[PDB]
Design a protein around this ligand. Structure first.
Ligand SMILES: CCCCCCCCCCCCCCCCCC(=O)OC[C@H](COP(=O)([O-])OCC(O)COP(=O)([O-])OC[C@@H](COC(=O)CCCCCCCCCCCCCCCCC)OC(=O)CCCCCCCCCCCCCCCCC)OC(=O)CCCCCCCCCCCCCCCCC
Ligand SMILES: CCCCCCCCCCCCCCCCCC(=O)OC[C@H](COP(=O)([O-])OCC[N+](C)(C)C)OC(=O)CCCCCCCCCCCCCCCCC
Ligand SMILES: CCCCCCCCCCCCCCCCCC(=O)OC[C@H](COP(=O)([O-])OCC[N+](C)(C)C)OC(=O)CCCCCCCCCCCCCCCCC
Ligand SMILES: CCCCCCCCCCCCCCCCCC(=O)OC[C@H](COP(=O)([O-])OCC[N+](C)(C)C)OC(=O)CCCCCCCCCCCCCCCCC
Ligand SMILES: CCCCCCCCCCCCCCCCCC(=O)OC[C@H](COP(=O)([O-])OCC[N+](C)(C)C)OC(=O)CCCCCCCCCCCCCCCCC
Ligand SMILES: CCCCCCCCCCCCCCCCCC(=O)OC[C@H](COP(=O)([O-])OCC[N+](C)(C)C)OC(=O)CCCCCCCCCCCCCCCCC
Ligand SMILES: CCCCCCCCCCCCCCCCCC(=O)OC[C@H](COP(=O)([O-])OCC[N+](C)(C)C)OC(=O)CCCCCCCCCCCCCCCCC
Ligand SMILES: CCCCCCCCCCCCCCCCCC(=O)OC[C@H](COP(=O)(O)OCCN)OC(=O)CCCCCCCCCCCCCCCCC
Ligand SMILES: CCCCCCCCCCCCCCCCCC(=O)OC[C@H](COP(=O)(O)OCCN)OC(=O)CCCCCCCCCCCCCCCCC
Ligand SMILES: CCCCCCCCCCCC(=O)OC[C@H](COP(=O)(O)OCC[N+](C)(C)C)OC(=O)CCCCCCCCCCC
Ligand code: SF4
Ligand code: SF4
Ligand code: SF4
Lengths: 97, 70, 156, 176, 378, 315, 102
């Protein structure tokens, strides 16, 4: 049933982030618990994901690092922490990460 | 999605549920496990006061059956 | 522990509340107001940050000056700012409110709303994209999160 | 060719009049409005999760002004003052003099970011692709003086963003 | 008669007699910045961005009026492909304008939902703007001689996708307003204007067509390639707010009709006049040819000279008849640029159209005129 | 045990109001293709807390008031009466079991009109006073239909006891024989509670609480949102009665609560779908459309039991 | 005794919430601030409500009056009052008494 695999997706998200602790970390940091393919990771700790089944605008996102340039960014994240090379791929100026 | 609106509704449902559950449980706690006596008219009040006297104790929710007779 | 520790956690409680319920009073004067409407539109949905779409001046915490402030409109702007209950913050949106922009050398333009009211965040662009304005609102939230109102009181 | 938008006469036969009578009394057409808003409750919202998701842009996007170099580290600007002359807002101020080796370079290059209208004429008028508008749109400040860029800020921007400016020009230079 | 100063960028000094309005006196100038005096210190290219900021909901239609006026004085002609990119983006810009007009008009009288549905579409039409010029609103794309740059590959495919699904969005808007009795009560028989008074007061656009006058500049005085496209001009019968609401909704549908034809009939070629003394050469040939480098140098420092003369050029802008009265003295800077904003005449008829109505009807009447104070005040 | 009982009523009432602000912003958001509050706490559950704290540590706004004592009397009356209209409600056992509970609720809601009037008086703004007088006229006008429609439904129940409306519907909902009255009762609750499309007090481009900002303004807000739930609780009991099983009282509350919520949601549903009336168009809806029909149906329901031998019991 | 206690509680709580809401903000000690023509239509609607409200006061005891044994008289008197209430509305309607267009 299509109604049961909805619950299955809601469960594979809990395991997708590596257990309850990882699931709650992303929920309280990004307010989104989706799971997507990992496209890469930059030298500052940022991880960049991809899910082409999502509508345009939500098919790419980044989970910011918890420490950049000696600053604690667990809660205080910023849109300017994306380095220039990933800035182009994140805003869909190109399809090439 | 839309189902993310339910957690807010759930809290409202629980909050509105407590007032009706609390009164029902408190009434059964204060009337010997029975519904609180309804007395809208003086006839129903006269019987309630009578049961208070017949109770022996000064309470109208203590009922006396066919054991006070003879 | 020390008294500063306790007073420094009450500060985080009030700072959390104030930066999580920013109610803006938008001064939509010119083209920049169209981008402000696009920040309330579905794609960015400012309301999901706790920033209601529009509030009356008496209920407002932040004033967004979005457009060209002219000499004729200046006194009316300072009156709305004086009637705002505190704490009150001001956000300057676009080049016109920053330094006059394209009309800097006009006879009927105030060269920056900072000449009339104090400003907390300057947002550059003509117009700033709705994403840049959102980035400027989130930067005001961090500015409210660094406030030390109670620490200053305790050490007075 | 024209068409009428509201020149239709209502039918006055008994069935039609009763249809409008039932509509007035039973609120039939006010319940269609409820239906349309009920559909949107079960649609996927178009919100994106900023600042973790961003809005799509293009290589032509006009953002923060910046100054570039050649692949050898030499500055591209040769102080021709064409950008200063076409800026509609008069936001560029330039002074120049011969460098120590005799090159034609600038001693001053200031852009008043609060006068700039972010129009892109300066990058059109530059004959050596020195000044460009980068892809950055997140540089809101807390003081008015931080929006008055001088040559050092503009050269730092070029060194900060060259990785992305270079790839944006490569994707669009065959149109301009 | 109670006098209320409904101040603030509009200030109305109204004279109420109970509920009715007896005299409505708009006070403007709260957005007067002296555009027409600044244009005299700029070259013709340096004055192009000023016209994006007159009616900031119809940016690329404002640019087109200025470009046609300057081309007329120059005596040059943009190439055919540039003309199709201007009819195409002049009808995308009409959807942007009518969405703002219809939804903001409905938002002031209470209906808050259609604003959020239709402003998602506006978000997608801003990406077309940003993919041809790099700026979401003030593209400065249409210029005297044609357009700045050619359309990027893949743009016309996306415009087609947006055009397929847009009619369904208008239908949802109509399911909320057209037959709603609350909405009709707020608009029907409100702000009635007679045909003879509409002409004499200086009205244009839907303010004329809502009262039955059959006039549309795209069909009577065509410009660019509007004579090669087929579309209908909706005409009202009652002359009230409800009729003008229907006219704006129907023009949105006919804009999709024009956009469908422009995509299919887009020809190849250049996108700016092949005259290097008016339009700059391409950067590739500005770096190899001396003549091209000389002409690039002068067009961005001194600009091109315009022969002496005066012209008044008008287009059917979404608001109405937008035009400039441009005077040249034979130099590279204009001598006088008078801007005829349609809202100036419409807002001046508020006192007449508001007679015998209530206080809350003034909001509906102001919104049916589609007033934007960037162009009213200039 | 009675003092505990009141707090088991008052405290959950305020929490329901606190999270009704959250739900209204999300349901409107999802009808408008948005998401609504989803940042402050998981799914926005901490958003009500943030607003409440912020509103109670914000600078007082009170300017000069002619009757400052009347400035404090108005919120107290509005919040005291809002909570007082809950004590006779059977859920399924009322806190105070009145023999004339229906009259009590009618009487209390007719006194809430003073909160609007006193607030307008103390505002020291002749324009705000006009706004308050318009609100009072709207409120009292629609109290006429609430009383007559309620009277027409009690002629099938037989008394003014709210607990008796449970018995009258033990076989069938009262909406079936009185759906014409339900439509007009439901719309009068919208107009009596000052809700869109009848909320012309919020005609910003076209209120009487403007003089209040933070603090007391929050108290008026809770009084209004407390009345929406109570009115929709009243409607459920009046037209959608639930079965009562004395040995399982909690089953009544669950079914009764769901109906009350769905009717509270419909208030949010309606605000998202329609534009607002003019003042003279929502006065014609009452005097020229509803009242003529309410009087006719009042005559019908007076004679309907008599001509069908279906007169309800007095006791 | 329970109704009096309940009324005392609701208006005591509402009193405390108001007084603290007027004082809790007044501890930040912010810097010192340093800063109608009578309408006859509003009166007419107010009076028309009063006369209808009094007529309703005579209709309230209808539920109890249906229990009498003189049903023919009760029904005639009940419809008489409602008809007279309808004639009162019909008089104001035709005399432009319900209009708001001055
Ligand atoms: C009221 C009626 C009962 C509510 C039941 C809702 C439900 O089960 O949704 C299933 C499903 C929702 O799917 P959908 O909205 O159509 O489309 C979403 C995508 O298909 C699938 O969307 P997705 O791929 O993004 O799925 C992700 C989701 C996995 O899917 C779910 O979690 C849905 C289950 C929600 C319950 O995982 C999560 O995101 C976890 C977040 C959970 C939030 C809390 C929701 C519980 C509310 C109750 C709070 C406690 C009381 O419902 C149906 O489609 C049919 C049944 C609807 C009536 C419910 C009958 C049971
Ligand atoms: C679904 C709704 C569940 C709501 C209740 C869940 C419990 C709330 C715990 C909140 C703790 C917040 C937190 O520290 O981050 C989450 C944490 C994150 O774990 P962490 O690995 O990132 O720990 C580091 C946290 N700092 C840096 C602050 C020390 O995960 C948990 O939930 C642990 C509890
Ligand atoms: C039952 C009814 C109540 C509903 C409760 C259910 C919701 C509880 C969720 C769990 C909350 C734990 C915190 C959430 C996880 C977390 O640590 O994230 C940090 C978050 C985020 O911090 P942030 O604001 O800096 O980060 C924002 C930026 N992003 C989104 C990118 C992360 O902060 C908090 O949640 C602080 C919560 C403070 C709670 C204050 C309660 C005060 C008590 C009332 C006042 C009493 C005095 C009068
Ligand atoms: C400050 C308060 C502002 C006004 C709100 C308070 C409204 C009070 C109404 C209470 C009486 C009522 O209507 O219910 C009768 C209700 C109607 O119930 P009943 O008609 O079903 O009969 C009850 C008893 N049986 C059923 C057995 C016959 O009567 C009672 O429940 C208790 C009897 C009355 C004793 C309590 C009244 C004391 C006097 C209190 C008023 C004090 C002055 C208030 C000043 C207000 C200023 C505006
Ligand atoms: C044997 C049988 C004998 C007895 C039969 C007795 C019944 C006979 C049938 C009578 C018809 C039923 C009358 C219903 C009342 C009609 C009111 C009316 O007159 O409307 C005209 C009025 C006014 O109509 P108008 O604006 O078109 O103008 C009428 C007058 N003219 C045309 C002359 C100008 O319309 C409205 O009432 C609209 C109000 C706005 C409503 C917006 C919210 C809508 C919400 C929809 C959901 C409602 C849910 C209801 C369920 C609640 C559940 C608890
Ligand atoms: C259009 C805008 C306004 C619309 C208002 C919509 C909200 C009003 C409520 C409509 C939904 C009806 C309640 C459905 C959920 C009730 C759950 C419940 O109590 O149990 C099932 C309830 C059973 O509860 P019950 O107690 O009422 O059933 C017994 C009925 N009597 C008392 C007559 C013996 O049954 C239903 O509500 C099924 C509803 C199907 C028809 C719709
Ligand atoms: C959930 C329920 C929500 C409702 C309950 C809300 C309660 C929220 C907690 C309140 C915590 C106290 C915050 C009071 C505001 C503090 C403040 O603004 O700091 C600036 C003020 C002013 O600092 P100042 O004196 O240095 O200011 C000087 C500068 N000028 C001249 C401009 C004013 O700091 C204080 O005065 C200290 C306040 C006393 C601390 C009170 C602690 C008691 C906590 C329990 C109450
Ligand atoms: C109603 C059914 C009915 O009238 O049958 C249809 C009949 C055919 O006539 P037709 O060709 O449709 O056009 C009208 C010609 N006079 O129509 C007729 O010709 C019937 C005669 C027309 C005049 C009848 C007017 C009757 C309407 C009075 C209101 C009836 C409802 C009253 C109850 C209201 C509450 C629901
Ligand atoms: C966080 C939530 C925590 C839960 C607790 C918060 C509320 C505090 C507890 C409530 C206070 C109760 C005080 C009390 O003991 O009341 C007893 C009294 C009993 O009534 P009685 O003795 O018959 O006669 C009273 C005549 N004045 O009854 C009374 O005194 C009457 C009530 C007086 C007002 C009580 C306070 C109202 C505000 C709450
Ligand atoms: C003793 C006084 C009573 C109040 C207790 C303190 C509450 C306020 C502190 C949180 C605000 C904050 O800062 O929220 C964000 C915090 C982390 O803070 P950070 O971002 O590292 O701040 C850095 C330091 N600054 C702010 C000075 C710059 O997230 C958390 O992990 C908190 C989540 C758990 C909160 C549970 C509170 C339970 C108490 C409920 C009854 C009072
Ligand atoms: S800064 Fe730009 S968009 Fe904003 S008002 Fe000025 S010209 Fe218009
Ligand atoms: S982008 Fe335009 S306004 Fe900004 S510096 Fe360049 S020419 Fe001047
Ligand atoms: S146009 Fe280019 S080379 Fe000439 S002064 Fe400006 S930045 Fe330098």
């Amino acid at each position: 049933m299509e109604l049961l695999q909805v619950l299955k997706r809601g469960l594979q998200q809990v395991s997708g982030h590596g257990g309850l602790r990882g699931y709650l970390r992303v929920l309280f940091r990004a307010n989104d618990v989706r799971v997507g393919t990992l496209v890469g990771e930059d030298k500052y700790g940022n991880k960049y994901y991809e899910d082409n089944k999502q509508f345009f605008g939500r098919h790419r996102w980044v989970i910011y690092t918890t420490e950049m340039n000696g600053k604690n960014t667990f809660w205080d994240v910023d849109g300017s922490m994306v380095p220039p090379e990933w800035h182009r791929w994140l805003h869909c100026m190109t399809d090439d990460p | 999605m839309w189902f993310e609106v339910l957690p807010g509704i759930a809290v409202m449902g629980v909050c509105l549920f407590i007032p009706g559950m609390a009164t029902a449980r408190i009434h059964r706690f204060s009337n010997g496990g029975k519904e609180k006596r309804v007395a809208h008219y003086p006839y129903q009040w006269y019987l309630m006061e009578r049961d208070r006297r017949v109770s022996g104790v000064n309470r109208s929710y203590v009922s006396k059956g066919l054991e006070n007779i003879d | 522990s020390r008294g500063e520790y306790v007073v420094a956690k009450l500060d985080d409680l009030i700072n959390w509340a104030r930066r999580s319920s920013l109610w803006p009073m938008t001064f939509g004067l010119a083209c920049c107001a169209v981008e402000m409407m696009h920040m309330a539109a579905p794609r960015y949905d400012m309301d999901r940050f706790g920033v209601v779409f529009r509030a009356s001046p008496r209920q407002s915490d932040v004033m967004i000056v979005a457009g060209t402030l002219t000499n004729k409109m200046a006194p009316a702007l300072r009156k709305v700012y004086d009637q705002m209950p505190e704490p009150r913050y001001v956000v300057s949106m676009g080049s016109c409110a920053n330094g006059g922009g394209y009309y800097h050398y006009s006879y009927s333009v105030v060269r920056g709303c900072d000449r009339i009211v104090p400003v907390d965040i300057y947002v550059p662009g003509c117009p700033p994209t709705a994403e840049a304005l959102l980035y400027g609102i989130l930067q005001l939230q961090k500015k409210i999160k660094r406030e030390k109102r109670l620490r200053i009181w305790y050490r007075r | 060719t024209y068409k009428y938008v509201n020149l239709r006469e209502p039918s006055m036969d008994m069935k039609s009049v009763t249809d409008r009578a039932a509509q007035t009394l039973l609120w039939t057409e006010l319940i269609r409005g409820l239906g349309m808003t009920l559909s949107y409750l079960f649609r996927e919202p178009a919100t994106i999760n900023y600042p973790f998701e961003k809005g799509p842009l293009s290589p032509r996007f006009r953002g923060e002004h910046a100054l570039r170099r050649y692949p050898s580290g030499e500055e591209r600007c040769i102080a021709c003052k064409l950008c200063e002359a076409v800026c509609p807002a008069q936001a560029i101020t330039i002074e120049a003099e011969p460098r120590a080796d005799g090159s034609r370079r600038t001693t001053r290059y200031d852009i008043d970011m609060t006068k700039c209208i972010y129009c892109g004429f300066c990058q059109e008028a530059c004959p050596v692709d020195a000044i460009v508008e980068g892809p950055n749109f997140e540089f809101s400040t807390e003081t008015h003086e931080e929006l008055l860029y001088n040559k050092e800020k503009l050269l730092n921007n070029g060194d900060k963003w060259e990785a992305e400016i270079a790839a944006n020009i490569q994707a669009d230079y065959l149109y301009r | 008669n109670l006098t209320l100063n409904f101040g603030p960028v509009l200030r109305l000094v109204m004279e109420l007699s109970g509920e009715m309005v007896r005299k409505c006196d708009p006070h403007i100038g709260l957005l007067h910045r002296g555009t027409e005096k600044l244009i005299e210190y700029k070259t013709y290219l340096q004055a192009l961005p000023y016209f994006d900021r007159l009616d900031y909901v119809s940016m690329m239609c404002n640019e087109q009026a200025y470009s046609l006026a300057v081309e007329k004085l120059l005596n040059i002609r943009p190439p055919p492909r540039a003309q199709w990119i201007r009819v195409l983006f002049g009808e995308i810009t009409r959807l942007l304008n009518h969405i703002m007009a219809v939804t903001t008009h409905a938002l002031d009288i209470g209906a808050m939902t259609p604003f959020f549905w239709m402003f998602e579409e506006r978000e997608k039409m801003f990406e077309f703007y940003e993919r041809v010029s790099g700026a979401r609103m003030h593209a400065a794309y249409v210029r005297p001689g044609g357009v700045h740059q050619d359309l990027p590959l893949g743009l016309m495919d996306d415009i087609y996708e947006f055009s397929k699904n847009f009619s369904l969005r208008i239908d949802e808007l109509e399911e909320m307003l057209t037959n709603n009795r609350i909405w009709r009560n707020r608009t029907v028989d409100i702000g009635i204007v007679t045909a003879e008074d509409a002409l004499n007061y200086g009205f244009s656009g839907v303010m004329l067509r809502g009262s039955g006058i059959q006039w549309d500049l795209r069909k009577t005085q065509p410009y660019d390639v509007y004579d090669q496209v087929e579309f209908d001009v909706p005409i009202g019968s009652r002359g009230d707010c409800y009729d003008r609401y229907l006219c704006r909704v129907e023009e949105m549908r006919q804009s999709i009709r024009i956009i469908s034809q422009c995509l299919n009939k887009m020809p190849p070629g250049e996108i700016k006049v092949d005259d290097a003394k008016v339009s700059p050469p391409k950067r590739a040939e500005m770096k190899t040819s001396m003549e091209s480098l000389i002409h690039h140098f002068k067009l961005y420092t001194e600009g091109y000279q315009v022969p002496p003369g005066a012209t008044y050029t008008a287009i059917e802008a979404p608001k109405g008849e937008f035009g400039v009265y441009l005077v040249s003295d034979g130099s590279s800077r204009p001598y006088r640029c008078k801007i005829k904003a349609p809202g100036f005449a419409h807002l001046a008829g508020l006192d007449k159209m508001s007679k015998g109505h209530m206080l809350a009807d003034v909001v509906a009447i102001i919104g049916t005129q589609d007033i934007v104070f960037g162009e009213v005040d200039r | 045990m009675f003092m505990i009982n009141i707090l088991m009523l008052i405290i959950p009432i305020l929490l329901a109001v606190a999270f009704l602000t959250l739900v209204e912003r999300k349901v409107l958001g999802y009808m408008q293709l948005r998401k609504g509050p989803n940042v402050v706490g998981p799914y926005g559950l901490l958003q009500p807390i943030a607003d409440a704290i912020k509103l109670f540590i914000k600078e007082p706004l009170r300017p000069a008031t002619s009757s400052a004592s009347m400035f404090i009397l108005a919120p107290i009356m509005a919040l005291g009466l809002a909570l007082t209209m809950w004590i006779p409600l059977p859920m399924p056992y009322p806190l105070i079991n009145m023999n004339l509970g229906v009259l009590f609720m009618l009487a209390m809601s007719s006194l809430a009109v003073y909160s609007i009037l006193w607030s307008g008086w103390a505002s020291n703004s002749k324009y705000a006073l006009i706004g308050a007088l318009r609100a009072v006229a709207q409120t009292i006008s629609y109290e006429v239909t609430l009383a007559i429609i309620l009277l027409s439904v009690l002629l099938m129940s037989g008394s003014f006891t709210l607990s008796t409306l449970i018995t009258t519907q033990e076989q069938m909902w009262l909406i079936l024989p009185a759906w014409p009255l339900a439509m007009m009762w439901f719309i009068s609750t919208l107009a009596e509670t000052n809700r869109a499309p009848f909320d012309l007090t919020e005609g910003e481009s076209e209120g009487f609480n403007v003089e209040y900002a933070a603090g007391p303004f929050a108290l008026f807000f809770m009084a209004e949102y407390a009345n929406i739930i109570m009115m929709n609780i009243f409607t459920a009991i009046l037209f959608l009665g639930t079965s009562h099983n004395p040995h399982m009282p909690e089953l009544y509350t669950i079914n009764f609560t769901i109906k009350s919520l769905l009717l509270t949601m419909s208030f949010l549903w309606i605000r998202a779908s329609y534009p607002r009336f003019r003042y003279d168009q929502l006065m014609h809806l009452l005097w020229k459309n509803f009242l003529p029909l309410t009087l006719a149906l009042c005559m019908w329901h007076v004679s309907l039991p008599i001509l069908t031998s279906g007169i309800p019991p007095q006791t | 005794m329970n109704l009096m206690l309940a009324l005392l509680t609701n208006f005591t709580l509402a009193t405390l919430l108001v007084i603290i809401a007027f004082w809790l903000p007044q501890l930040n000690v912010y810097s010192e601030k340093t800063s109608l023509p009578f309408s006859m239509k509003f009166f007419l609607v107010a009076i028309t409500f009063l006369l209808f409200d009094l007529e309703i006061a005579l209709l309230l005891p209808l539920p109890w009056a249906s229990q009498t044994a003189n049903l023919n008289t009760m029904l005639t008197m009940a419809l008489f009052l409602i008809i007279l209430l309808a004639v009162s509305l019909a008089y104001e309607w035709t005399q432009k008494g319900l209009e708001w267009t001055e």
